[PDB]
Each structure stands twice: as C-alpha cells, then as structure tokens.
Design a protein around this ligand. Structure first.
Ligand SMILES: Nc1ncnc2c1ncn2[C@@H]1O[C@H](COP(=O)(O)OP(=O)(O)OP(=O)(O)O)[C@@H](O)[C@H]1O
Ligand SMILES: OC[C@H]1O[C@@H](O)[C@H](O)[C@@H](O)[C@@H]1O
Length: 247
C-alpha cells in the first residue's frame, strides 16, 4: 500500500523499483500526490522536495517518475509549485532546492515542466542572519542562482524557451538580484571575485535584453540603489568595482 511514511521512505532511498504501483494506487483511490495524506502536516512538504533533499551524486531517479505520475493524476503544475507553508521555510519550492543543491538538470526539468520561476522563499530561514535567518539571497530563484555563484543556472533561468526569470524583479524588501549580490558580498577575495563577475553579467544581460530599463536605478524599500546599499553597509569590494566602470 502507499501512505506518507512509505512514500517518503521510498523516495528518500531513491528507489524507483518501489514506486511500482503508485500511479494505479492513486487512480483507483481518487488520490493525488498533493493531497494532505501525502504531505508533512507541519510544513506542507510533498515528496518532491523530499526527493530533492536526498540526492546521491545529485541524482534521485524518483523525481522524473514522481513528476510523470503527477502529470497523469492531472496534477503536475500544482505538484511542482507546492510551497513549504510553515513560518520558517515558507514559500520554498522544489525549484529553490534544485538550485541550492546545485543540480542544473533538475532545474531544467522543473522549469520545462512549469515551475513558477518567481517563487519567493520568504520564511525565517531565508531572511538575514541578524533577523534570525540562515542565508539571505533575495528570496527569488534567479537571485538565489546569482548569490550562490551558478552562472550556468543564471543563464538558463533568464533565457530559456519555457519561462524566463525577469531580472528586474524585487523581493519583500524590494531587493533585486543586484541588491542581493551586495548583501551576499563580504569583501573576501574569492567572494568579491564572483560577486563582481556576476554583477557585470547581470547588468550587461539586462541592458542587452530590455534595451532601456536601467537596473541599477531600481531602488530597494529603504530607497537605496545597489551602489548606495554597498556604501551604506561597508561593502568596500563591490562598491569600488561599481564605481570603476563609470565615465
Ligand atoms: N527545507 C529544507 N531546505 C534545505 N535543507 C533541508 C530542509 N529540510 C531539511 N534539510 C536538510 O537536508 C537533509 C534532507 O532532509 P530530508 O527531508 O531528507 O530529511 P528530514 O525530513 O529533514 O529529516 P528526516 O531524515 O527525519 O526525514 C536533512 O538532513 C536536513 O539537514
Ligand atoms: O576563504 C578562503 C579564502 O578566500 C578569499 O576570498 C579570502 O580573502 C581569504 O582570506 C581566504 O583564505
């Protein structure tokens, strides 16, 4: 039979073998993979995130199966965009996890299949450390991809045939991938190296697409541009780099 613990065990193990029977099961009992019986009741977590949080060499073969089953229970978009709903991981989705676990293949698979690319990770865990969080990257898939130094993913997200992430997008703070980048900045060599490269990457991309929407001009909720934000918060490295490319 199939209940939450059995389903989670199977996916946690990456066993596609054991998923045999699931589709007929759900079909005959009128169940879906998004039904409450199949989520962690605290967080609302489905078995999709469960799968992603148990990779093995960044593989969990049950993922493409779970997706196909959701498709076939008429349920795929809802399934993929099912968000954590608890105060701590609120808003997080399968897409966020694919990005953070650094697996481009699942990002592509997820995006191609309809993943909301502007889903905001809003919960405590995603806010700044000083505000009781763990890692702040501006909440959005793109900003996450940028902040964790994954240019290939960043390019995938901004130019793909399915759904492009708008770079002008802002989080709850009105922060932008640029703002996010400075928040990420910590002045150390390798940090400044990538943060800088990335900043340039996005700035040039946003100029070449959308010829006339200057992204540095988008202010945050504190009405700070990314430049001033760096300034105000001691981000020497990134700040100098911004100025360098003036007149
Ligand atoms: N929401 C999350 N986002 C990112 N990482 C997580 C999250 N939840 C758990 N983790 C980490 O990733 C690992 C995988 O989580 P997974 O869902 O497989 O197990 P769990 O439900 O967290 O714990 P258990 O092993 O009791 O089920 C955990 O060991 C935890 O350290
Ligand atoms: O953390 C590894 C290294 O990274 C650099 O970006 C820092 O400036 C160094 O001080 C450090 O040894």
């Amino acid at each position: 039979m199939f209940n939450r613990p059995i389903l989670f065990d199977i996916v946690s193990r990456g066993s596609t073998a054991d998923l045999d029977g699931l589709l007929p099961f759900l079909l005959t009992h009128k169940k879906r993979l998004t039904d409450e019986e199949f989520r962690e009741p605290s967080t609302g977590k489905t078995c999709l995130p469960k799968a992603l949080l148990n990779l093995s060499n960044g593989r969990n073969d049950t993922i493409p199966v779970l997706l196909d089953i959701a498709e076939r229970t008429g349920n795929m978009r809802e399934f993929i965009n099912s968000p954590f709903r608890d105060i701590y991981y609120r808003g997080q989705t399968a897409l966020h996890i694919a990005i953070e676990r650094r697996c481009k293949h699942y990002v592509e698979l997820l995006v191609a299949q309809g993943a909301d690319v502007h889903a905001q990770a809003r919960g405590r865990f995603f806010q700044p450390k000083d505000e009781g969080g763990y890692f702040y990257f501006g909440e959005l898939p793109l900003s996450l991809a940028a902040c964790t130094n994954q240019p290939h993913i960043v390019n995938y997200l901004t130019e793909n045939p399915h759904k492009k992430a708008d770079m002008r997008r802002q989080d709850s703070r009105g922060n932008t991938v640029l703002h996010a980048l400075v928040a990420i900045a910590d002045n150390t060599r390798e940090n400044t190296k990538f943060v800088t490269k990335m900043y340039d990457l996005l700035l040039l991309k946003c100029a070449r697409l959308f010829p006339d929407s200057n992204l540095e001009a988008v202010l945050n909720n504190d009405g700070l541009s990314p430049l001033m934000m760096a300034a105000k918060t001691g981000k020497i490295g990134i700040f100098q780099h911004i100025i360098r490319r003036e007149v």
